[PDB]
Curated annotation (Swiss-Prot):
The gene is ANXA4. GO terms for molecular function: calcium ion binding; calcium-dependent phospholipid binding; calcium-dependent protein binding; identical protein binding; NF-kappaB binding; phosphatidylserine binding; phospholipase inhibitor activity; transcription regulator inhibitor activity. It is found in: Zymogen granule membrane. Gene3D superfamilies: Annexin. It comes from Homo sapiens (Human). The modification N6-acetyllysine is found at residues 211, 291, 298. One of its GO terms (cellular component) is nucleus. This is Annexin A4. Annexin repeats lie at residues 12-83, 84-155, 167-239, 243-314. The modification Phosphothreonine is found at residue 5. PROSITE patterns: ANNEXIN_1 (PS00223), ANNEXIN_2 (PS51897).
Length: 317
């Protein structure tokens, strides 16, 4: 509703930007501020035009140069910014699954918050890039009910449109209420089938009906009736169906509120949402947490890494 912080620049001159960036890198050292002052003030599409212009104006490769000159978390953010939107998601999913470990939080976040149409583009691109099925990789990297949720989301087969079947909304709400009072454990299949199959309008109506019949929010019941990564995935679906901006505020809060910082999450959220809904994220952050997002980033990061994240945030003093 308020939208993003990062917008398409006016007066955009790709060749001039190419020259600014080369000047920033050429010779010993780097002018990191100059890099920020260009890249954080162009949108992702414009940054692709810079890449093209850099080859033809400078006779070099921009990403290669950035990678050579920069390091650490600042390099990660800048290279992130330079990556086409779909490919960035693809590469984040790959990173989350590569090796014996898994970044489960990353999988949840992307697969719960992207639309089916976005998931299909991601899935296609992952297949083309790696010659691997996204669904098959997810299936390998996760287990049990958590796997069922993530495989379903990755398959991108949720009902679409906004058709409202009042009788089915009622039935679903009742079914979820009963699934929670089954004698020998929650019926987790009912939860995951409703939450993974139904269209958004329908689910928003189920959530309201569930509260009407149970006097409890569906999130409260999820928290008391499920556990583990499976719980976390179901909560992510619900939160994303209600208000994805709020979900991402929560993701940012959790990435910073502890001792230390979940940089991978902070970076991905800030890069991936700066053009979509960062102003809404900021608003919801302030409501939930009574502090500005800006102040959290300022307090938990430093250096050029801080600088660029604060430009992505927008604001604020
Ligand atoms: Ca240099
Ligand atoms: Ca793995
Ligand atoms: Ca911290």
């Amino acid at each position: 509703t308020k939208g993003g912080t990062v917008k398409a620049a006016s007066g955009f001159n790709a060749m001039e930007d190419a020259q600014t960036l080369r000047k920033a890198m050429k010779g010993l050292g780097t002018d990191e501020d100059a890099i920020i002052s260009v890249l954080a003030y162009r949108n992702t599409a414009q940054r692709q035009e810079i890449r093209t212009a850099y080859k033809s104006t400078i006779g070099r490769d921009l990403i290669d140069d950035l990678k050579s000159e920069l390091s650490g978390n600042f390099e990660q953010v800048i290279v992130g910014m330079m990556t086409p939107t779909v490919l960035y998601d693809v590469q984040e999913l790959r990173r989350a699954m590569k090796g014996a470990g898994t970044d489960e939080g990353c999988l949840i976040e992307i697969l719960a918050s992207r639309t089916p149409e976005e998931i299909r583009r991601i899935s296609q691109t992952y297949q083309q890039q790696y010659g691997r099925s996204l669904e098959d990789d997810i299936r390998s990297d996760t287990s049990f009910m958590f796997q069922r949720v993530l495989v379903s989301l990755s398959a991108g087969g949720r009902d679409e449109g906004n058709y409202l079947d009042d009788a089915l909304v009622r039935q679903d709400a009742q079914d979820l209420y009963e699934a929670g009072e089954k004698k020998w454990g929650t019926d987790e299949v009912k939860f995951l089938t409703v939450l993974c199959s139904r269209n958004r309008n329908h689910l928003l109506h189920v959530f309201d009906e569930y509260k009407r019949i149970s006097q409890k929010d569906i999130e409260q019941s999820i928290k008391s009736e499920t556990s583990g990564s499976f719980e976390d995935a179901l909560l992510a679906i619900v939160k994303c169906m209600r208000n994805k901006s709020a979900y991402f505020a929560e993701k940012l809060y959790k990435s910073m509120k502890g001792l230390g910082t979940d940089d991978n999450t902070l970076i991905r959220v800030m890069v991936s949402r700066a053009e979509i809904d960062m102003l809404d994220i900021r608003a919801h952050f302030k409501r939930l947490y009574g502090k500005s997002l800006y102040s959290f980033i300022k307090g938990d990061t430093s250096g050029d890494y801080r600088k660029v994240l604060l430009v992505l945030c927008g604001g604020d003093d």
